[PDB]
């Protein structure tokens, strides 16, 4: 478990692969057999990510040209997915794919998404050198 | 004799079975439509081997 | 007080496989994703640039994208061009008549919603996923000729995210129901004569 | 040597519109057969020595 | 993108085609479907016998060698007609009949 | 005995179902099934304003990509006489005579890929690449969408556009003769295309056909003369036609016309009142005060553009011809801003009326050649 | 007759060859041309100052 | 003409090859596709029905003339092998032989047999 | 022939197919069978589908007097596409929950 | 409102058309009898008329009857603004059938065919009188400004 | 026609849409300082036909 060398301990990291993805899926395959279960997000689009990982946040649906205020008041995706998770599960493995009144998901927002691992095992995504590398994003954060 | 052999060799190994990258093998495909997996693989093989 | 909650994960998902029996299917799916072939289909306002994907401006054939004009052979189809009510009752036949490793995607913002055909008209279908289950939705009318390659690169990872036990989630059952009719037949209307 | 013919066929693939099977039979029957017989008729006396 | 160049792309397409869930359509079955391409592949595979490659590298002297090659070259059309007729619909019946 | 030629339609222009009888190898009767791409624009065209309706035209029109906006701007600007300057008119002439090329390529290339020319498919795309940069840098994303506002055009085309034809402008000229020497070469090219789908002129005008497909019978019914469209006719030209009308005549008439495109472009770039755009750019800074510049001449916009304008009863028709075929938008002159009824008259809908009467006692290959040479596309047909 | 055929059978073949070999040696400079087409996906096209993307 | 044992081994091996490939495909395959699966492809119309699509009238003549003109070769081969071995009588005999079928082909050419 | 409205999760087949394979894709089209969502967009327990099976007679016998045209097929599919929407809007049925793309034709869940 | 050149040539035959006045765009308009759409078609080509124009549908008002329109022109080598002739014939929802020119000149094989489904008025003198635009499955006649546009889930407010 | 330069243009496209309902583009993160073709360290884009020099 070479990923296991830098996921269980750190719980905060970013994947720096070549910009093709044809070498990284094998890593994700191995992390379905401990208690880690996938949550891909593609972070681009949401506001302050706190209310996207802890609070009931009204996600305004794609509007249909008409109908003034109509927002279905969507729920968060942490405690409910825990409720669906079995009591036998190590961590929530989550991928912030797009880590590269809105709120810019800057490095401060990633630090604030590096606390839910401590206080969801999140990994940021950003393409990089031909060799698949990983690096703690918290030190890159700020 | 070599001229005849060379020109015949084309159609003998199915060259060309379809005239154009868009035009089909004269109906929709060369009798290998339903042949999906190892079947079309074997036909690709036999063509290259001819 | 949640509306339409998600079903519970029935299995505990607790297992462990050997590497000598897992890397086989791993590289198998690697080849399955790195050898995909397109399936020809294109109708309307979100299609034409697909042709430019074969030339010196965009070349997706550089990755082995062999364009096959037949359902039973290929596995990748692009629902390019805005689809209407008709040409759909024969479109889904394509998805029904190809091998199981399809992993179809979408293309054209007018195919994920029906963008410029969404005020009032009894022809256009609202999105494609209400007809066929696909994976990725592609924006743009016309769709950005580079965004399609980026979305192909995106989908290229989902197949790599598959394991040996995943080759059982394509097996089907039959909810075949026994119910008859009582009505009158209609002779063929599409009479082929001039 | 066979690679040379592989390349020749590859090139010819993009130089001629392959005929339809209304001309292909004509070419195969009324064109290649007479000369492919005549070359043998010639080589008979050619190898007569 | 299949490595440096497509040196692995060919066998990659081969392995992909390997699984591809052979469908075996309804009209016509294993009675002639699987029997079709076997004749096709054997007609050209067996021809490799008398083909030489270099000074004393022939697989069989076989004084009837090129004759055997000509004889085995005219067995494929049987398999092509069988395959093209192993189904029922058009685009395969005439599609194979033409060839 | 009868099979369909496939809604998958292994052809150029999309989806066409052709149900046809089959006596083993030859066919007896074929029939087309149309209506699978209903853009239903005739409905929305009443429930909309003009500017919100402007980008709608190059949607069911992506092959022509420009022959839909001519009439779509005739109704707002040419009807109520919001005087279009002759300089902006020459700009629109540059546009139209480049769309002639945009059609010539996107037919001949695929026509080459239908007739039997297997290699030049990517060649014509490599030639066309420059028109992409032009349409992008002129007004819009890729199809140059929204190049026609009401009071003129969107914005005068930038400086790196007009005076910068020269590259393709003399490249394609020497490139044309390539196709002309290739077509007469390898008569297998010519043998299969000659003597198929022949049509006469009296039936070409009796069936309602148009375009170079009709001009190829000595008819010369080229509607680039009969209309004072934006007072374009100051330029000179040469009628393109033939005297047979068949598929080979179609190829000849559609290869002999694009030579006039760059000719008209050369007429314009030096005959436009502003000429090149960088010329007018460097001229409006020495005479900023007052001149013929920015006057009734040399102005992109005459009055304010806005979705508010009333109309009187005036139901005018224009038979604006595209190198694919004619086009017309008749419309009941209504007193309201948006009008009562809309209507379109596309060439594709006025082309396949002869289609089942073209392929008579032929084979599947003959049908393929005729349908590849006829220069037909969907999108225009259904509307 | 046949004398006309015995005179034209070489003419048909010589026309076929004069076209085939001519096109062959003409496309010779095409099969081994010196143009470089679109590069890898890391070499996107240049974009001038009038387009539309994400508003 | 000494040992065709290599020929027999190659026969059995290359005949096991296709069934081996089919069985290997079958082992690692999906037990799935209970869909319609009763219609072939490139026919998005879900069509069905039809017969009497033959046009054998034309191709049958080609097949016949080929079947008749083929027997020439398997007689020429024993002659083509025994030219120098024997004298020049076999030359004249085979010339008469081939010329008979040349006349036959001339006849089949004049009267319309080899057509569209 | 077998001209049926084969929309997603709504396939009112105008022909008898309730074998593993219909053996003709129509079986002479004398039964008008139906299969429910082969893509497993919804997981089915028999009791939940029992109301749909009961109202099938309400849709095939109670309000059918028109010949075998897809007009009636849309007349069926219209209410078919909303019976499921009602059965979900009151929480009795839920989505796929498998290893597919897990698409949301009706959007993500809500908080009522 | 007065007669036309066609009437100028035709009055000598004592069979007059429906003499209507000018159009709005700047040209004239005429009219022919509905049930007598064949006489005009057989006399116009004798005068030299062989090209149609403006094959469109119509409605009288929102909540009104139906109609049809036919403009006409010719093709000649030396031509200078061929005469602009227009016909606009009205017809009722009851017995909505007008003759067709398909059998006199063959320029409208599919032109009138779209109106065979588009609006609620069919026409004889045209084989294959069936739907093309709208699916054959559908039965209704759309595009009438008073027609009940299908108030299904896919048009009105769906939230 | 917007009063003060509000509605503008950009140009990227990595819309990894796994569902339609994930497209709420509010005020500022729309900026995101996008790809910046010239600001990348793996890009050297030569100008195309109509943007390069003559000949």
From Swiss-Prot, chain D:
The chain crosses the membrane at residues 31-49. It is found in: Plastid, Chloroplast thylakoid membrane. Disulfide bonds: none annotated. NDH is composed of at least 16 different subunits, 5 of which are encoded in the nucleus. Belongs to the complex I subunit 1 family. NDH shuttles electrons from NAD(P)H:plastoquinone, via FMN and iron-sulfur (Fe-S) centers, to quinones in the photosynthetic chain and possibly in a chloroplast respiratory chain. The immediate electron acceptor for the enzyme in this species is believed to be plastoquinone. Couples the redox reaction to proton translocation, and thus conserves the redox energy in a proton gradient. This is NAD(P)H-quinone oxidoreductase subunit 1, chloroplastic. It comes from Hordeum vulgare (Barley). The gene is ndhA. The chain holds residues 312 to 360 of 362 of the full protein.
UniProtKB/Swiss-Prot annotation, chain J:
Its EC number is 7.1.1.-. It holds the Pfam family Complex1_30kDa. It is found in: Plastid, Chloroplast thylakoid membrane. The keyword Repeat does not apply. Keywords: Chloroplast, Membrane, NAD, NADP, Plastid, Plastoquinone, Quinone, Thylakoid, Translocase, Transport. HAMAP family: NDH1_NuoC. PANTHER family: NADH DEHYDROGENASE [UBIQUINONE] IRON-SULFUR PROTEIN 3, MITOCHONDRIAL, NADH DEHYDROGENASE UBIQUINONE IRON-SULFUR PROTEIN 3. InterPro entries: NADH_DH_suC (IPR010218), NADH_quin_OxRdtase_su_C/D-like (IPR037232), NADH_UbQ_OxRdtase_30kDa_su (IPR001268), NADH_UbQ_OxRdtase_CS (IPR020396). This is NAD(P)H-quinone oxidoreductase subunit J, chloroplastic. Gene3D superfamilies: NADH:ubiquinone oxidoreductase, 30kDa subunit (3.30.460.80). GO terms for cellular component: chloroplast thylakoid membrane. NDH is composed of at least 16 different subunits, 5 of which are encoded in the nucleus. It comes from the Eukaryota. GO terms for biological process: photosynthesis, light reaction. NDH shuttles electrons from NAD(P)H:plastoquinone, via FMN and iron-sulfur (Fe-S) centers, to quinones in the photosynthetic chain and possibly in a chloroplast respiratory chain. The immediate electron acceptor for the enzyme in this species is believed to be plastoquinone. Couples the redox reaction to proton translocation, and thus conserves the redox energy in a proton gradient. It is a peripheral membrane protein. It catalyses: a plastoquinone + NADH + (n+1) H(+)(in) = a plastoquinol + NAD(+) + n H(+)(out); a plastoquinone + NADPH + (n+1) H(+)(in) = a plastoquinol + NADP(+) + n H(+)(out).
């Amino acid at each position: 478990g070479r990923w296991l060398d830098d996921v269980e301990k750190h719980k905060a990291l970013a994947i720096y692969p070549p910009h093709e993805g044809g070498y990284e899926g094998r890593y994700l395959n191995r992390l379905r057999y401990q208690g880690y279960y996938f949550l891909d997000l593609s972070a681009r689009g949401l506001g302050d990510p706190e209310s996207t990982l802890t609070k009931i946040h009204p996600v305004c649906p794609p509007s249909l040209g008409r109908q003034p205020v109509a927002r279905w008041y969507f729920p968060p995706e942490v405690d409910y997915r825990l409720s669906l998770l079995h009591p036998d599960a190590k961590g929530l493995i989550v991928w912030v794919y797009e880590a590269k009144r809105l709120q810019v998901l800057s490095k401060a927002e990633l630090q604030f998404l590096a606390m839910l691992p401590d206080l969801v095992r999140v990994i940021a995504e950003c393409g990089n050198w031909r060799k698949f590398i990983w690096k703690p994003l918290k030190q890159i954060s700020g | 004799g070599f001229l005849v052999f060379l020109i015949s060799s084309l159609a003998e190994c199915e060259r060309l079975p379809f005239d154009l990258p868009e035009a089909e093998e004269e109906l929709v495909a060369g009798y290998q439509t339903e042949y999906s997996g190892i079947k079309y693989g074997l036909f690709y093989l036999v063509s290259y081997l001819n | 007080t949640v509306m339409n909650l998600i079903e519970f994960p029935l299995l505990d998902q607790t297992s462990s496989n050997s590497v000598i029996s897992t890397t086989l299917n791993d590289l198998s799916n690697w080849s399955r994703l790195s050898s995909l072939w397109p399936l020809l289909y294109g109708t309307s306002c979100c299609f034409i640039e697909f042709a430019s994907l074969i030339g010196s401006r965009f070349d997706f054939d550089r990755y082995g994208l062999v364009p096959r004009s037949s359902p039973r052979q290929a596995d990748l189809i692009l629902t390019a061009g805005t689809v209407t009510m008709k040409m759909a009752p024969s479109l889904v036949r394509l998805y029904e008549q190809m091998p199981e490793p399809k992993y179809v995607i979408a293309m054209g913002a007018c195919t994920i919603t029906g963008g410029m055909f969404s005020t009032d008209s009894y022809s256009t279908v609202r999105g494609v996923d209400k007809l066929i289950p696909v994976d990725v939705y592609l924006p743009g009318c016309p769709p950005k000729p580079e965004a399609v390659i980026d979305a192909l690169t995106k989908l290229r990872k989902k197949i790599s995210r598959e394991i040996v036990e995943d080759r059982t989630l394509s097996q089907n059952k039959k909810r075949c129901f026994t119910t008859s009719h009582k009505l009158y037949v209609r002779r063929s209307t599409h009479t082929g004569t001039y | 040597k066979a690679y040379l013919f592989l390349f020749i066929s590859i090139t010819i693939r993009w130089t001629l519109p392959r005929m339809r099977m209304d001309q292909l039979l004509n070419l195969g029957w009324k064109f290649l057969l007479p000369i492919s017989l005549g070359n043998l008729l010639l080589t008979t006396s050619f190898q007569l020595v | 993108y299949a490595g440096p160049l497509g040196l692995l792309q060919a066998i990659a397409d081969g392995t992909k085609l390997l699984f591809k869930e052979d469908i075996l359509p309804s009209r016509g079955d294993i009675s002639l479907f699987s029997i079709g391409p076997s004749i096709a592949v054997i007609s050209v595979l067996l021809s490799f016998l008398v083909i030489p490659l270099g000074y004393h590298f022939v697989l069989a002297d076989l004084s009837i060698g090129v004759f055997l090659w000509i004889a085995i070259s005219s067995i494929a059309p049987i398999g092509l007609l069988m395959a093209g007729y192993s189904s029922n619909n058009k685009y395969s019946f005439l599609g194979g009949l033409r060839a | 005995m009868i099979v369909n030629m496939g809604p998958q339609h292994p052809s150029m222009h999309g989806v066409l179902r052709l149900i046809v009888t089959l006596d083993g190898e030859d066919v007896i009767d074929c029939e087309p099934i149309l209506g699978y791409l209903h853009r239903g624009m005739e409905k929305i065209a009443e429930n909309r304003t003009i500017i919100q309706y402007l980008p709608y035209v190059t949607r069911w029109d992506y092959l022509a990509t420009m022959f839909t906006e001519a009439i779509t701007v005739n109704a707002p600007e040419f009807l109520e006489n919001i005087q279009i300057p002759q300089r902006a008119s020459y700009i629109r002439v540059i546009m139209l005579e480049l769309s002639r090329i945009a059609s010539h390529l996107l037919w001949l290339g695929p026509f080459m890929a239908d007739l039997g020319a297997q290699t030049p498919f990517f060649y014509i795309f490599r030639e066309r690449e420059l028109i992409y940069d032009l349409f992008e840098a002129a007004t819009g994303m890729r199809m140059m969408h929204n190049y026609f506002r009401i009071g003129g055009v969107a914005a005068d085309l930038p400086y790196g556009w007009i005076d910068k034809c020269l590259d393709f402008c003399d490249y394609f000229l020497r490139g044309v003769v390539e196709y002309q020497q290739l077509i007469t070469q390898n008569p297998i090219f010519l043998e299969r295309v000659e003597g198929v789908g022949f049509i006469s002129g009296e039936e070409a005008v009796n069936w309602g056909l148009s375009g170079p497909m009709l001009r190829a019978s000595g008819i010369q019914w080229d509607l680039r003369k009969v209309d004072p469209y934006e007072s374009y006719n100051q330029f000179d030209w040469k009628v393109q036609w033939q005297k047979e009308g068949d598929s080979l005549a179609r190829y000849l008439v559609r290869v002999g016309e694009m030579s006039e495109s760059i000719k008209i472009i050369q007429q314009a770039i030096e005959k436009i009142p502003g000429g090149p755009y960088e010329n007018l750019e460097v001229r409006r800074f020495k005479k900023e005060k007052n001149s013929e510049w920015n006057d009734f001449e040399y102005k992109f916009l005459g009055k304010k553009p806005s979705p508010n304008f009333e109309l009187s009863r005036q139901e005018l028709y224009v038979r604006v011809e595209a190198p694919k075929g004619e086009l017309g938008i008749y419309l009941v002159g209504d007193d309201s801003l948006f009008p009562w009824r809309w209507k379109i008259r596309p060439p594709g809908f006025i082309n396949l009326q002869i289609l089942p009467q073209l392929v008579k006692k032929m084979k599947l290959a003959d049908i393929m050649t005729i349908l590849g040479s006829i220069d037909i596309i969907m999108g225009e047909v259904d509307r | 007759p046949m004398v006309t055929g015995f005179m034209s059978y070489g003419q048909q073949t010589i026309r076929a060859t004069r076209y085939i070999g001519q096109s062959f040696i003409t496309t010779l400079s095409h099969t081994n041309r010196l143009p470089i087409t679109i590069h890898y996906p890391y070499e996107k096209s240049i974009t001038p100052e009038r387009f539309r993307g994400r508003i | 003409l000494h040992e065709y044992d290599i020929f027999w081994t190659f026969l059995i091996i290359a005949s096991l090859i296709p069934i081996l490939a089919f069985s290997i495909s079958g082992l690692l395959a999906p037990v799935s596709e209970g869909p319609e699966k009763l219609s072939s492809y490139e026919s998005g119309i879900e069509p069905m029905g039809g017969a009497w699509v033959q046009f054998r009238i034309r191709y049958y003549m080609f097949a016949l003339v080929f079947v008749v003109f083929d027997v020439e070769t398997v007689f020429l081969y024993p002659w083509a092998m025994s030219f120098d071995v024997l004298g020049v009588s076999v030359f004249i005999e085979a010339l008469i032989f081939v010329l008979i079928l040349v006349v036959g082909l001339v006849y089949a050419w004049r009267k319309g047999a080899l057509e569209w | 022939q077998w001209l049926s409205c084969t929309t997603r999760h709504v396939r009112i087949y105008a022909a008898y197919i309730d074998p593993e394979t219909n053996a003709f894709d129509q079986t002479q089209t004398d039964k008008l069978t139906l299969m429910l969502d082969p893509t497993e967009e919804f997981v089915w327990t028999d009791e939940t589908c029992q109301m749909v099976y009961n109202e099938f007679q309400d849709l095939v016998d109670h309000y059918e007097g028109a010949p075998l045209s897809e007009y009636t097929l849309r007349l069926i599919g219209s209410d078919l596409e909303h019976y499921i929407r009602k059965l979900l809007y009151d929480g009795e049925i839920k989505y796929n929950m498998r290893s597919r793309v897990l698409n949301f034709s009706m959007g993500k869940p809500r908080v009522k | 409102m007065q007669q036309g050149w066609l009437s100028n040539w035709l009055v000598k035959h004592e069979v007059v058309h429906r003499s209507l006045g000018f159009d709005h765009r700047g040209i004239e308009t005429l009219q022919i009898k509905a049930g007598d759409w064949d006489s005009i078609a057989v006399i116009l080509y004798v005068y030299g008329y062989n090209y149609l124009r403006s094959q469109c549908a119509y409605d009288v008002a929102p909540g009104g009857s139906l109609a049809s329109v036919y403009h006409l022109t010719r093709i000649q080598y030396g031509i200078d603004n061929p005469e602009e002739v227009c016909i606009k014939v009205f017809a009722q929802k009851d017995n909505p059938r007008i003759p067709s020119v398909f059998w006199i000149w063959r320029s409208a094989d599919f032109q009138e065919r779209e109106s065979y489904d588009m609006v609620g008025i069919s026409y004889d003198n045209h084989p294959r009188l069936k739907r093309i635009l709208m699916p054959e499955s559908w039965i209704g006649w759309p595009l009438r400004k008073d027609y009940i546009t299908p108030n299904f889930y896919e048009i009105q407010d769906a939230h | 026609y917007c009063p003060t330069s509000c509605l503008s243009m950009t140009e990227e496209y990595e819309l990894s849409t796994y569902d339609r309902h994930e497209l709420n583009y509010n005020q500022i993160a729309l900026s995101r300082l996008p790809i910046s073709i010239m600001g990348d360290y793996t890009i050297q884009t030569i100008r195309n036909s109509s943007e390069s020099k003559i000949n």
